[PDB]
Amino acid sequence: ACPEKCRCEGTTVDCSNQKLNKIPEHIPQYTAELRLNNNEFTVLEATGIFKKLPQLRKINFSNNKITDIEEGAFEGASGVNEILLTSNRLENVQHKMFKGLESLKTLMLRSNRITCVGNDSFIGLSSVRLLSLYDNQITTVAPGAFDTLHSLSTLNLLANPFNCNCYLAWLGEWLRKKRIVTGNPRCQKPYFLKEIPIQDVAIQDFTCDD
Ligand SMILES: *[C@@H]1O[C@H](CO)[C@@H](O)[C@H](O)[C@H]1NC(C)=O
Cα–Cα distance, 197 to 194 (Å, whole number): 9
Tell me which method was used to determine the 3D structure.
X-ray
Q: What is the CATH number of the domain that holds 118?
A: 3.80.10.10
**Residue-range definition of the domain harbouring residue 122:** 1-210
Give the C-alpha distances (Å, rounded to integers) separating 170 from 43, 146, 206.
34, 12, 9
> In which element (H, E) is residue 43 found?
strand 43-44
Q: Of ligand 1's atoms, which has the minimum distance to the CA of residue 123?
A: 5
Is residue 147 in contact with ligand 1, taking CB distance under 6 Å?
Answer: no
Q: 86: burial class by Cβ within 10 Å (0-12, 13-18, 19+)? A: buried
φ and ψ at residue 154, rounded to 5 degrees: -135, 110
Reduce the DSSP state of residue 131 to 3 states and report it. Answer: strand
Cα–Cα distance, 93 to 203 (Å, whole number): 28
Cα–Cα distance, 93 to 67 (Å, whole number): 10
Q: How many domains in the chain?
A: 1
Establish how many alpha carbons lie within 13 A of residue 156's alpha carbon, considering only the half-sphere containing its beta carbon: 15
Cα–Cα distance, 97 to 46 (Å, whole number): 10
Residues 6+ positions from 128 with CB-CB distance below 8 Å: 104, 105, 106, 107, 149, 151, 152
Is residue 55 in contact with ligand 1, taking CB distance under 6 Å?
Answer: no
> What resolution in angstroms does the PDB record give?
3.0
Contact yes or no for 124/97 (Cβ under 8 A): no
Cα–Cα distance, 62 to 50 (Å, whole number): 18
Kindly report the protein residue whose alpha carbon is nearest to atom 13 of ligand 1. Answer: 119
